[PDB]
Amino acid sequence: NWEHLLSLKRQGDTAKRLRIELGFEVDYDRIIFSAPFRSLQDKTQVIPFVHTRLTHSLEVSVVGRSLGRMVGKKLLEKYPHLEQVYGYKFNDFGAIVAAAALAHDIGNPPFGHSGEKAIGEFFKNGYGKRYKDSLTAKEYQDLIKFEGNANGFKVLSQSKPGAQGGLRLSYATLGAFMKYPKESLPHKPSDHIADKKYGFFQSERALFEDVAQELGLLKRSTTDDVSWSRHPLAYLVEAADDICYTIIDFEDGINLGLIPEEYALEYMVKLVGQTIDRNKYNALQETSDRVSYLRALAIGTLINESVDTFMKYEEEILAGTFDQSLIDKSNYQAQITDIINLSIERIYNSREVIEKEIAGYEILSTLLEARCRALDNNDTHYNQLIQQLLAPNDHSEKSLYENLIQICAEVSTMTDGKALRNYKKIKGL
Amino acid sequence: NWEHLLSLKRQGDTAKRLRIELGFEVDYDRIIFSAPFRSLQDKTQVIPFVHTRLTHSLEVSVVGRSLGRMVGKKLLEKYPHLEQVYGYKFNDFGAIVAAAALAHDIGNPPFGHSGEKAIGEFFKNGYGKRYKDSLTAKEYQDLIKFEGNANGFKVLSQSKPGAQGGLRLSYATLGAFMKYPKESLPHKPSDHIADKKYGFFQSERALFEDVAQELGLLKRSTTDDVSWSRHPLAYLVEAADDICYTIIDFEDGINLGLIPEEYALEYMVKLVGQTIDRNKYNALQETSDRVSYLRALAIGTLINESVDTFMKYEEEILAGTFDQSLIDKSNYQAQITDIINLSIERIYNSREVIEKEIAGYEILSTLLEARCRALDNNDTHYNQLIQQLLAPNDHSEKSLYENLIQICAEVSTMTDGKALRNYKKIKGL
Amino acid sequence: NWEHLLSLKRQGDTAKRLRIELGFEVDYDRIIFSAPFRSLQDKTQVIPFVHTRLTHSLEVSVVGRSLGRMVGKKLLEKYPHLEQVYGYKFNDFGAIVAAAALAHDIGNPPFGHSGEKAIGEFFKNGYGKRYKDSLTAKEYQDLIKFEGNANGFKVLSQSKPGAQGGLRLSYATLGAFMKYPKESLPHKPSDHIADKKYGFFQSERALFEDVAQELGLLKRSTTDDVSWSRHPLAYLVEAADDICYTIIDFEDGINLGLIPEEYALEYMVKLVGQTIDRNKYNALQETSDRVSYLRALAIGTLINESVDTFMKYEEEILAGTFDQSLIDKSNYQAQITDIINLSIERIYNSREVIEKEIAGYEILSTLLEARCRALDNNDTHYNQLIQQLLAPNDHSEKSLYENLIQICAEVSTMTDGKALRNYKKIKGL
Ligand SMILES: [Mg+2]
Ligand SMILES: [Mg+2]
Ligand SMILES: [Mg+2]
């Protein structure tokens, strides 16, 4: 039911909010001005001009806003009652998808997936193994299979003294942000696209249950482990992100010298052939302009194809029977796969990227060990100094799992500069 | 008895030295030219122009020289026989107090009290725990509650081949230097000001017993753990040090931007009100000049008040019944406490000071562990290299406690530059 | 028999190669263009202009070429049949000795003998102790008493896919390169000069047995541990190396300020007195020119003396009864010993040299531990990253000893720059 999916409800609301009577734009406005989003300006994208996480978020938001606007147009033309009595507009869908896409990278720890694996391995085989017997199975699982999507949900909606609900985003935006509406256990029960990872920690189970019950998400789990169907706009958000990750990593790889210019045309002829102006392409004198020209065309065709695919399986998506992505139903699957493989071989496996990941591991391991050692023995002078350096903000009487997840969130959201400086101080440099 | 307190005896002397027949100035002259005192030029004062330990010592010596000169004037006017037959002058008292105050920071390890705690924790929970069973209780206590006052006494009077008695200072200067004339055990038996810490290690017990017996210090301990009353001039030395630590840390904090200018006048009106020239204060155009002007006034009034307090309780001080400091009997106690608390909150708890302390811990721990590992196994090539790098001076057949205390003294007296360079070499940088 | 000693056989040869029917010059040509030899341009000689390992190799090759040419002249005049029917020339001997001397430093790990001791201690008391029970006694011995001569033999003759036999040097060059033709066990069975160390690992036993059987080296071991007599030209190669190590370390020490100018003349008068032009020496205005002038004279007289000594004991050398070096039979033994001791006290025991050795230990230990930990568990993400960073070249199904010796060879042949960069990445800098 689309009426419940486009909920304007926020945390702490008592009276129901109706479309015909704050707005989805306000979510984007709040995310833009938020400190965690601003902090993305000092966070890199694990590549050797090259995009930072802030620009990637910006570009993803721009693709998601286009996808959502077109999808809202088509749904409003398919469900007249959504605008006749409920008063919804395609700009609403665009705003929801743009706000969800803008914050999709707000909780990811530095150094890419290597940082997530470092946080996981710290609690699996490192100093964090001591907490295994003091936590429940799902809590420990969250600790060992730490992902930045659950951390991003935590950042977007975590209460603090004087700020309940965090950014207080609308429930539609929160639902679109959740790509994996399931708990930390069981680990990958099936081949469904939404079961690859989890989207919320144990400290957010009640809040996401409230969000799902407000959005009317279908309960797909018959056991005691909660799991819901994906929000239909989460498909658009993820498709936008994949389109950017594919076409823009290739642009960045080509412009940085890691990928020769021939592969650009070689893997973009199929994508851009239907709309390329050959005279304009040949008239361009710089490689950067040509690759930008190709990137714009490819993004446009992929956006249109994703909109067509979404409207092809709307009923299946709303029922929860869709087990793959919108980009997986692409006619350009071979070219997309070839581009992704070439990017993996030339960028992600480059020395510079490997070197950086090896440093992240040592920095994150050191910081996590220092924070945990301070947590266990908060009486020594060195531990008091560590607490002052890394957690001067506040202190409270919380549980062990809350403290550990707070440590993980604080370490994940540090800027590369702040993390490196703290690691050097702790290492006496 | 003041005649015995103003002893001209030095180490190795056989014939008694009389005032009417080398001089207390010679102690100051020797300390100035000594290598350990010179080494203070490369040692910082754990603050982010800002005073180094050498300038702090200089300024403390200047306050102690004023206090001692006034106190000597008043005692000579109170005991005519001290000058009529013994031939003592107020310049003697000034010289003794100045020499004691100049060397009050000569044995402190770097990074402030954090370095002392690092040396203590190395032998308490670190690699140094292995020596607990091979040493006596007091020897191990000295190792684990290491203070820079005992190390300063060691530096001032430790024999070397060709140099017996070290700087060979007069016994009056050594007595005035000793703020805590007691052994390492028991640990804080009472609330007496002299029982807060200890002033000499176990390798200096015989020498300080000789010094105390020459100065006629009263034995306040009836057990087998020796402890004596404070030398009366030690009160003046400590009062001078506290006055500088209070008024000059505030000046440094104000001039460094950590403390706004308003608090200067706010906490100095009471101290300087009786002697401030308002026209001169308002005519000054720079904040540094105004704060210097206030610091000079406050130091003057505190010096006069300390002299008055010392002459108020002279008999009690000479009997050993005084359990507090001269600054503790101040009418400006509230303002002094407020200034100290503001300095603690704004300087000592600043990031930059915390960061520095966290680095000291790692550097001192690394250096101590390397030295100890070289000491236990002096056969490996790496350990021979470590011994050459850190202890090339000499080697001898000494006991385990002597070797450990020598390691602690050598690490404590390294310059920040030398310590950092050695730590980087050991860390392969 | 000199005919078999001057073998032109190379790895993989089936038909016998005769002198009268590729050439010993080709070995020098190949070594010059080889990547391992080129890599010596970025490797230092553990001294604070100062020689790198490449220039030391160059200079040693030049001394060995002179020694071999004179020795070949004298042998051809002593054995006419070597040139009458076999067709050998003195240039052959010169080429063999020069090629052997040029590669004498091609397998030495950085940081001098400190690096060799670090590799040994890693497997003796470090993380490498776990492999003791999984290897044979001699294999583990090779691991713990690792020397750069065996590694240099490995570099010169190790097969790779597409390159069998490595540089494919002539067997005479390989025999002259081998200073210690014996296995890793027993460790120093006697006082013979060839029994001080070993010259090949266990992975090269068959190849060196083939080389020795082709060269007709005398089997000096009656047990199951193979050991052969030294090749006669190995004496010349080692003598050349010692002459350079003695006279040129002194030149470098004098020119670097670690050795005053007086000792130059003081320890060179005896060596250069018979051929020095006093007018030329006094006319020189720079210390560098005078020391160069003295170095050239000393090298010349030592070369002539070494040739005379070699021809004095030719029969004893060819029978294998010579237990010392050519330089040990020198009339300038006292002056050579004095120069070596002065160099040890002033250069090798300098701070800068000690500091560098302390850093090597930490870098090599860190790199070896990382490589071994990657080897044991090649499933973790961090270990895969380490394998990509340090061993991206290739992978194969080899034994544990082969993998460990490959790790040791790869670490030993890294350039100081590459090693330091990898150590910093692993240390997160
Ligand atoms: Mg993305
Ligand atoms: Mg002081
Ligand atoms: Mg050599």
Side-chain angles (χ1 to χ4, degrees), chain A residues 1-2 4-20 22-82 85-120 122-159 161-190 192-195 197-208 210-213 215-221 225-265 267 269 271-273 276 278 281-284 287-288 290-307 309-314 317-322 324-328 330-337 340-344 346-350 353-377 380-383 385-386 388-392 396 398-401 403-409 411-429, chain B residues 1-2 4-20 22-82 85-120 122-159 161-190 192-195 197-208 210-213 215-221 225-265 267 269 271-273 276 278 281-284 287-288 290-307 309-314 317-322 324-328 330-337 340-344 346-350 353-377 380-383 385-386 388-392 396 398-401 403-409 411-429, chain C residues 1-2 4-20 22-82 85-120 122-159 161-190 192-195 197-208 210-213 215-221 225-265 267 269 271-273 276 278 281-284 287-288 290-307 309-314 317-322 324-328 330-337 340-344 346-350 353-377 380-383 385-386 388-392 396 398-401 403-409 411-429:
Chain A
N1 183 341
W2 272 106
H4 305 186
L5 293 168
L6 310 176
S7 160
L8 289 165
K9 182 170 172 356
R10 293 165 201 277
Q11 209 258 12
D13 283 332
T14 56
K16 182 115 151 34
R17 302 190 192 217
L18 299 166
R19 177 69 175 88
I20 39 66
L22 195 48
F24 298 118
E25 338 297 344
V26 179
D27 294 7
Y28 188 92
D29 289 345
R30 285 172 191 200
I31 293 169
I32 281 288
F33 276 98
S34 85
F37 176 78
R38 277 167 167 183
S39 78
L40 295 177
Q41 101 173 13
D42 320 290
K43 292 176 186 182
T44 47
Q45 269 246 304
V46 206
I47 314 178
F49 162 77
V50 73
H51 286 64
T52 67
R53 287 166 68 176
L54 180 75
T55 320
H56 166 79
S57 292
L58 261 190
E59 275 147 13
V60 177
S61 197
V62 166
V63 173
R65 178 163 248 135
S66 295
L67 284 161
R69 274 201 285 241
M70 306 184 218
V71 155
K73 226 155 293 172
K74 274 181 198 226
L75 279 148
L76 284 198
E77 98 190 327
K78 193 208 215 200
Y79 301 96
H81 64 87
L82 274 175
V85 49
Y86 300 129
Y88 284 108
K89 318 284 208 317
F90 71 96
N91 270 269
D92 293 335
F93 299 83
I96 292 163
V97 182
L102 192 68
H104 91 283
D105 199 12
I106 212 161
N108 282 107
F111 318 104
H113 73 129
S114 267
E116 309 183 86
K117 284 189 188 350
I119 294 172
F122 171 80
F123 290 100
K124 182 96 177 139
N125 318 309
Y127 180 79
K129 200 160 28 50
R130 23 176 318 160
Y131 307 112
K132 167 158 187 13
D133 299 335
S134 310
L135 311 157
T136 69
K138 292 189 292 185
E139 277 172 64
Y140 186 63
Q141 177 78 7
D142 289 281
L143 281 192
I144 62 149
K145 287 294 180 199
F146 187 103
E147 313 106 14
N149 308 16
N151 198 45
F153 188 68
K154 198 182 197 326
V155 172
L156 290 179
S157 70
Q158 79 152 325
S159 295
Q164 298 312 298
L167 300 191
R168 302 208 58 244
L169 304 181
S170 97
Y171 274 15
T173 306
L174 293 179
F177 173 81
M178 194 74 51
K179 282 175 29 45
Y180 313 103
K182 68 178 287 280
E183 267 173 5
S184 64
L185 281 186
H187 176 274
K188 199 123 61 174
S190 57
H192 200 286
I193 186 59
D195 292 15
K197 325 172 163 235
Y198 64 87
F200 58 96
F201 294 131
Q202 282 317 102
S203 35
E204 290 118 286
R205 191 197 166 181
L207 168 71
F208 185 66
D210 184 1
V211 167
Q213 96 93 30
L215 296 171
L217 297 183
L218 310 165
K219 291 198 133 300
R220 193 173 40 117
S221 66
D225 289 345
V226 302
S227 148
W228 294 270
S229 318
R230 256 198 201 170
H231 197 292
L233 305 182
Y235 285 96
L236 295 176
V237 175
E238 156 186 316
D241 179 10
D242 311 308
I243 287 160
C244 287
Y245 154 78
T246 310
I247 311 299
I248 302 163
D249 257 7
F250 203 43
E251 183 178 2
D252 272 325
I254 290 160
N255 276 303
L256 258 166
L258 303 170
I259 301 189
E261 183 178 2
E262 294 179 351
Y263 306 88
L265 247 192
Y267 305 128
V269 277
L271 287 145
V272 317
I276 182 171
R278 307 300 312 220
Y281 182 85
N282 294 109
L284 292 160
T287 299
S288 318
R290 294 194 286 274
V291 183
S292 268
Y293 176 77
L294 293 179
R295 174 253 299 147
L297 291 171
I299 280 185
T301 59
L302 282 176
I303 284 177
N304 281 34
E305 197 198 23
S306 299
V307 173
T309 298
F310 182 87
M311 287 309 261
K312 193 188 169 113
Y313 304 97
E314 183 280 335
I317 277 158
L318 231 194
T321 78
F322 212 64
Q324 332 176 82
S325 69
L326 296 181
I327 207 81
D328 289 345
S330 194
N331 312 94
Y332 312 119
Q333 186 173 355
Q335 296 87 353
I336 286 160
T337 294
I340 287 175
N341 300 341
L342 177 63
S343 301
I344 281 178
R346 301 264 191 161
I347 310 161
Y348 290 102
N349 275 50
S350 64
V353 174
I354 285 155
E355 286 191 357
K356 200 222 208 100
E357 293 177 350
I358 282 157
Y361 251 94
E362 174 81 40
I363 291 155
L364 289 192
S365 288
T366 298
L367 288 167
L368 281 166
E369 184 153 323
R371 275 296 290 271
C372 283
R373 278 181 184 283
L375 176 83
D376 289 345
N377 326 129
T380 88
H381 189 80
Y382 181 80
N383 290 137
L385 297 178
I386 287 292
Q388 257 169 117
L389 180 83
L390 303 181
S396 158
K398 278 170 160 165
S399 79
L400 178 68
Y401 167 70
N403 277 110
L404 291 178
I405 210 68
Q406 203 56 358
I407 286 167
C408 285
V411 166
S412 285
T413 63
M414 253 172 215
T415 52
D416 289 345
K418 214 187 138 96
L420 192 58
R421 183 191 190 50
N422 289 347
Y423 167 78
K424 293 177 140 147
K425 284 331 168 194
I426 285 149
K427 283 328 194 155
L429 311 149
Chain B
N1 183 341
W2 272 106
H4 305 186
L5 293 168
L6 310 176
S7 160
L8 289 165
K9 182 170 172 356
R10 293 165 201 277
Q11 209 258 12
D13 283 332
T14 56
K16 182 116 151 34
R17 302 190 192 217
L18 299 166
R19 177 69 175 88
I20 39 66
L22 195 48
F24 298 118
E25 338 297 344
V26 179
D27 294 7
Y28 188 92
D29 289 345
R30 285 172 191 200
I31 293 169
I32 281 288
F33 276 98
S34 85
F37 176 78
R38 277 167 167 183
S39 78
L40 295 177
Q41 101 174 13
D42 320 290
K43 292 176 186 182
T44 47
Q45 269 246 304
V46 206
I47 314 178
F49 162 77
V50 73
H51 286 64
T52 67
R53 287 166 68 176
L54 180 75
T55 320
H56 166 78
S57 292
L58 261 190
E59 275 147 13
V60 177
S61 197
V62 165
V63 173
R65 178 163 248 135
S66 295
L67 284 161
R69 274 201 285 241
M70 306 184 218
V71 155
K73 226 155 293 172
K74 274 181 198 226
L75 279 148
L76 284 198
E77 98 190 327
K78 193 208 215 200
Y79 302 96
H81 64 87
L82 274 175
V85 49
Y86 300 129
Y88 284 108
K89 318 284 208 317
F90 71 96
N91 270 269
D92 293 335
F93 299 83
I96 292 163
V97 182
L102 192 68
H104 91 283
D105 199 12
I106 213 161
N108 282 107
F111 318 104
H113 73 129
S114 267
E116 309 183 86
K117 284 189 188 350
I119 294 172
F122 172 80
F123 290 100
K124 182 96 177 139
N125 318 309
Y127 180 79
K129 200 160 28 50
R130 23 176 318 159
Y131 307 112
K132 167 158 187 13
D133 299 335
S134 310
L135 311 157
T136 69
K138 292 189 292 185
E139 277 172 64
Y140 186 63
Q141 177 78 7
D142 289 281
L143 281 192
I144 62 149
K145 287 294 180 199
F146 187 103
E147 313 106 14
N149 308 16
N151 198 45
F153 188 68
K154 198 182 197 326
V155 172
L156 290 179
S157 70
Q158 79 152 325
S159 295
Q164 298 312 298
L167 300 191
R168 302 208 58 244
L169 304 181
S170 97
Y171 274 15
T173 306
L174 293 179
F177 173 81
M178 194 74 51
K179 282 175 29 45
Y180 313 103
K182 68 178 287 280
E183 267 173 5
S184 64
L185 281 186
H187 176 274
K188 199 123 61 174
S190 57
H192 200 286
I193 186 59
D195 292 15
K197 325 172 163 235
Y198 64 87
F200 58 96
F201 294 131
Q202 282 317 102
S203 35
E204 290 118 286
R205 191 197 166 181
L207 168 71
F208 185 66
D210 184 1
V211 167
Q213 96 93 30
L215 296 171
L217 297 183
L218 310 165
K219 291 198 133 300
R220 193 173 40 118
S221 66
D225 289 345
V226 302
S227 148
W228 294 270
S229 318
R230 256 198 201 170
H231 197 292
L233 305 182
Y235 285 96
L236 295 176
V237 175
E238 156 186 316
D241 179 10
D242 311 308
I243 287 160
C244 287
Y245 154 78
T246 310
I247 311 299
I248 302 163
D249 257 7
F250 203 43
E251 183 178 2
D252 272 325
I254 290 160
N255 276 303
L256 258 166
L258 303 170
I259 301 189
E261 183 178 2
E262 294 179 351
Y263 306 88
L265 247 192
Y267 305 128
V269 277
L271 287 145
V272 317
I276 182 171
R278 307 300 312 220
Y281 182 85
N282 294 109
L284 292 160
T287 299
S288 318
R290 294 194 286 274
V291 183
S292 268
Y293 176 77
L294 293 179
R295 174 253 299 147
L297 291 171
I299 280 185
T301 59
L302 282 176
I303 284 177
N304 281 34
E305 197 198 23
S306 299
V307 173
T309 298
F310 182 87
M311 287 309 261
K312 193 188 169 113
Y313 304 97
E314 183 280 335
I317 277 158
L318 231 194
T321 78
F322 212 64
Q324 332 176 82
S325 69
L326 296 181
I327 207 81
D328 289 345
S330 194
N331 312 94
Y332 312 119
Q333 186 173 355
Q335 296 87 353
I336 286 160
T337 294
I340 287 175
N341 300 341
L342 177 63
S343 301
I344 281 178
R346 301 264 191 161
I347 310 161
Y348 290 102
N349 275 50
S350 64
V353 174
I354 285 155
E355 286 191 357
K356 200 222 208 100
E357 293 177 350
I358 282 157
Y361 251 94
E362 174 81 40
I363 291 155
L364 289 192
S365 288
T366 298
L367 288 167
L368 281 166
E369 184 153 323
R371 275 296 290 271
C372 283
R373 278 181 184 283
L375 176 83
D376 289 345
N377 326 129
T380 88
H381 189 80
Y382 181 80
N383 290 137
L385 297 178
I386 287 292
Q388 257 169 117
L389 180 83
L390 303 182
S396 158
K398 278 170 160 165
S399 79
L400 178 68
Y401 167 70
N403 277 110
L404 291 178
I405 210 68
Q406 203 56 358
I407 286 167
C408 285
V411 166
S412 285
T413 63
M414 253 172 215
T415 52
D416 289 345
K418 214 187 138 96
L420 192 58
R421 183 191 190 50
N422 289 347
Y423 167 78
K424 293 177 140 147
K425 284 331 168 194
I426 285 149
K427 283 328 194 155
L429 311 149
Chain C
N1 183 341
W2 272 106
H4 305 186
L5 293 168
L6 310 176
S7 160
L8 289 165
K9 182 170 172 356
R10 293 165 201 277
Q11 209 258 12
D13 283 332
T14 56
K16 182 115 151 34
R17 302 190 192 217
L18 299 166
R19 177 69 175 88
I20 39 66
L22 195 48
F24 298 118
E25 338 297 344
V26 179
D27 294 7
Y28 188 92
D29 289 345
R30 285 172 191 201
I31 293 169
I32 281 288
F33 276 98
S34 85
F37 176 78
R38 277 167 167 183
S39 78
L40 295 177
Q41 101 173 13
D42 320 290
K43 292 176 186 182
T44 47
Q45 269 246 304
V46 206
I47 314 178
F49 162 77
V50 73
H51 286 64
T52 67
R53 287 166 68 176
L54 180 75
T55 320
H56 166 78
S57 292
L58 261 190
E59 275 147 12
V60 177
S61 197
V62 166
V63 173
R65 178 163 248 135
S66 295
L67 284 161
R69 274 201 285 241
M70 306 184 218
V71 155
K73 226 155 293 172
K74 274 181 198 226
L75 279 148
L76 284 198
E77 98 190 327
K78 193 208 215 200
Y79 302 96
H81 64 87
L82 274 175
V85 49
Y86 300 129
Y88 284 108
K89 318 285 208 317
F90 71 96
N91 270 269
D92 293 335
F93 299 83
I96 292 163
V97 182
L102 192 68
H104 91 283
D105 199 12
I106 213 161
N108 282 107
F111 318 104
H113 73 129
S114 267
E116 309 183 86
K117 284 189 188 350
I119 294 172
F122 172 80
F123 290 100
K124 182 96 177 139
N125 318 309
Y127 180 79
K129 200 160 28 50
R130 23 176 318 159
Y131 307 112
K132 167 158 187 13
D133 299 335
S134 310
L135 311 157
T136 69
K138 292 189 292 185
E139 277 172 64
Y140 186 63
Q141 177 78 7
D142 289 281
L143 281 192
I144 62 149
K145 287 294 180 199
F146 187 103
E147 313 106 14
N149 308 16
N151 198 45
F153 188 68
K154 198 182 197 326
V155 172
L156 290 179
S157 70
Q158 79 152 325
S159 295
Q164 298 312 298
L167 300 191
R168 302 208 58 244
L169 304 181
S170 97
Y171 274 15
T173 306
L174 293 179
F177 173 81
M178 194 74 51
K179 282 175 29 45
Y180 313 103
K182 68 178 287 280
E183 267 173 5
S184 64
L185 281 186
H187 176 274
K188 199 123 61 174
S190 57
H192 200 286
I193 186 59
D195 292 15
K197 325 172 163 235
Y198 64 87
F200 58 96
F201 294 131
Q202 282 317 102
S203 35
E204 290 118 286
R205 191 197 166 181
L207 168 71
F208 185 66
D210 184 1
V211 167
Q213 96 93 30
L215 296 171
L217 297 183
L218 310 165
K219 291 198 133 300
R220 193 173 40 117
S221 66
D225 289 345
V226 302
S227 148
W228 294 270
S229 318
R230 256 198 201 170
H231 197 292
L233 304 182
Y235 285 96
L236 295 176
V237 175
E238 156 186 316
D241 180 10
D242 311 308
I243 287 160
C244 287
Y245 154 78
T246 310
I247 311 299
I248 302 163
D249 257 7
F250 203 43
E251 183 178 2
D252 272 325
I254 290 160
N255 277 303
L256 258 166
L258 303 170
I259 301 189
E261 183 178 2
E262 294 179 351
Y263 306 88
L265 247 192
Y267 305 128
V269 277
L271 287 145
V272 317
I276 182 171
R278 307 300 312 220
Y281 182 85
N282 294 109
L284 292 160
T287 299
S288 318
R290 295 194 286 274
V291 183
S292 268
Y293 176 77
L294 293 179
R295 174 253 299 147
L297 291 171
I299 280 185
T301 59
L302 282 176
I303 284 177
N304 281 34
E305 197 198 23
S306 299
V307 173
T309 298
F310 182 87
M311 287 309 261
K312 193 188 169 113
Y313 304 97
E314 183 280 335
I317 277 158
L318 231 194
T321 78
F322 212 64
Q324 332 176 82
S325 69
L326 296 181
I327 207 81
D328 289 345
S330 194
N331 312 94
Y332 312 119
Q333 186 173 355
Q335 296 87 353
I336 286 160
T337 294
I340 287 175
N341 300 341
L342 177 63
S343 301
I344 281 178
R346 301 264 191 162
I347 310 161
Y348 290 102
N349 275 50
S350 64
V353 174
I354 285 155
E355 286 191 357
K356 200 222 208 100
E357 293 177 350
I358 282 157
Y361 251 94
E362 174 81 40
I363 291 155
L364 289 192
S365 288
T366 298
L367 288 167
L368 281 166
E369 184 153 323
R371 275 296 290 271
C372 283
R373 278 181 184 283
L375 176 83
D376 289 345
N377 326 129
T380 88
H381 189 80
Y382 182 80
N383 290 137
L385 297 178
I386 287 292
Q388 257 169 117
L389 180 83
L390 303 182
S396 158
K398 278 170 160 165
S399 79
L400 178 68
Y401 167 70
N403 277 110
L404 291 178
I405 210 68
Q406 203 56 357
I407 286 167
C408 285
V411 166
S412 285
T413 63
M414 253 172 215
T415 52
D416 289 345
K418 214 187 138 96
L420 192 58
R421 183 191 190 50
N422 289 347
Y423 167 78
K424 293 177 140 147
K425 284 331 168 194
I426 285 149
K427 283 328 194 155
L429 311 149

